DNA sequence: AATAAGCGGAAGTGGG
DNA sequence: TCCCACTTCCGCTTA
């Protein structure tokens, strides 16, 4: 099953969900969510791991925290929404 | 207060 | 057995 780390990068590669998350420097690889259209996106990831629950964007998110630990995706400070993968996720 | 978001421990579910 | 990669639940904190 894909991991939510690549369902976020292949959403942003292919502007699929442009209103609910986009690029905001591309090149260091940071990305925003939509403060109001991102439980759409949340509504997706679930249905694509088939979840007994309908996903919310603060249980996407409470998954997200766990890859800040790792580094695969770092949550920026000082900021609300916005996230920034790792190289070695963005090198594929 | 109402709303939104951050924070994160702990326990539950999948598939090895 | 026991870790993976989240998911779900709960509640407190900050804005
Ligand atoms: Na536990």
């Known amino acids: 099953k894909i991991r ?9 590669r292919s502007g699929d969900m442009k209103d609910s998350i986009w690029w905001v420097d ?3 690889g940071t990305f925003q969510f939509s403060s109001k259209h991102k439980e759409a996106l ?8 088939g979840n007994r629950k309908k996903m919310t964007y603060q ?6 925290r766990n890859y800040g630990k790792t580094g695969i995706i770092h949550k920026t400070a000082k900021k ?10 963005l090198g594929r």
């Open 4 to 12: 939510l780390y690549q369902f976020l990068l292949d959403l942003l």
């Open 26 to 28: 591309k090149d260091k």
């Open 42 to 49: 949340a509504h997706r990831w679930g249905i694509q791991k």
């Open 59 to 64: 249980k996407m998110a409470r998954a997200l």
């Open 80 to 89: 609300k929404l916005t996230y920034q993968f790792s190289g070695e996720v």
